[PDB]
Amino acid sequence: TLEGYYVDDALQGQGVYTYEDGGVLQGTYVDGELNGPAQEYDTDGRLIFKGQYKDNIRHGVCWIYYPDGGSLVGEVNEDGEMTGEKIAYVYPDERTALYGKFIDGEMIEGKLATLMSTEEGRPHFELMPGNSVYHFDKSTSSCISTNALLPDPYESERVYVAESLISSAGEGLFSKVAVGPNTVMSFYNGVRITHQEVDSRDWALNGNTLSLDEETVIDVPEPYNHVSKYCASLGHKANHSFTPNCIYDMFVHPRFGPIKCIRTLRAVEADEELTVAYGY
């Protein structure tokens, strides 16, 4: 088959679609509509969906994987949307998860949990003990967080703040455990401000600004650069080096929203200081 895109077989059964852009989609078909097991991949070989369809709407328990390694899994609603009471955002280690109430893939109330096993397609989670509820809480131009002192579950296991070993750098960010290359370790969340705002005020104030996109800049200003005032995320604590063990990369966070992460470039040691090359 060929439309300027591409499709594979006669009536129905199990076929593959490919878009004007390289990305595949493996579906099982029934009368030309999708019904059954599907898996879609990225223009780059990356699994971005696994799960199933019924009358061309996503059905059942489906996995959506972001490029950063994080994922969303749950039984979808009648419209195929990630809305329900038993949905989870799962972190890049594929084990820590925030389970619970989500609207449209957005988190209303997520409880710390662990994904013990995918038995079939379905996954089994188990709640972790503790009072901790997490909520979608994107920061604004003036509110860095609705709960500045609730740490991020994933971060508090892989990293910590302490005196820098670098010459005169105040504090730094340390790895807590040994990790191999390409590992997310910490989140860089702050108030969202505009490039012009950052370009026009005294520059002596952009020590913690980090550009998100062509329109937005994340900053960790005011007194939130002190951990007794803010510790939700710890990214703004990594110091600079010309030969870093880490890189800034994009991240889709369930509490923070579109932000950056600190990801490792090589294996790193427990207790090793984490660095990135500032300014890209």
Ligand X SMILES: Nc1ncnc2c1ncn2[C@@H]1O[C@H](CSCC[C@H](N)C(=O)O)[C@@H](O)[C@H]1O
Q: Would you call 59 a catalytic residue per the annotation?
A: no
Residue 150 exposure: Cα atoms within 13 Å on the Cβ side: 14
Residues 173-232 that bind ligand X (CB under 6 A): 207-208, 225
Distance CA 172, CA 236 (A): 9
CB of 173 to ligand X, least distance (A): 7
Q: Is 266 in the site for ligand X (CB under 6 A)?
A: no
Using CB atoms, what's the residue nearest to ligand X? 170
168 touches ligand X (CB under 6 A):
yes
Placement of tokens 């750098």 in the chain:
169
Binds ligand X (CB under 6 A): choice among 71, 239, 245, 264:
239
Confirm whether 135 is a catalytic residue. no
Q: Which residue in the set 26, 39, 216, 241 belongs to the binding site for ligand X (CB under 6 A)?
A: 241
Size of the chain, expressed as the number of residues it contains: 280
Q: Residue 8: which residues within 8 A CB-CB, separation 6 or more?
A: 1, 15, 16, 17
Indicate if 188 belongs to the active site: yes
Answer yes or no: are the C-beta atoms of 130 and 112 closer than 8 Å. yes
Instruction: Point out the catalytic residue in the list 66, 135, 160, 278.
Output: 278
Among 108, 133, 148, 169, binds ligand X (CB under 6 A): 169
Taking the C-alpha atoms of residue 144 and residue 148, their distance in angstroms, rounded to an integer, is 7
Q: Which of 27, 74, 75, 82 is nearest to 55 (CA)?
A: 27
Which residues carry out catalysis? Answer: 188, 236, 240, 248, 278
Binding residues for ligand X, rule: CB under 6 A, are 164, 166, 168-171, 207-208, 225, 236-241
The annotated binding site for S-adenosyl-L-methionine is made up of: 169-171, 239-240
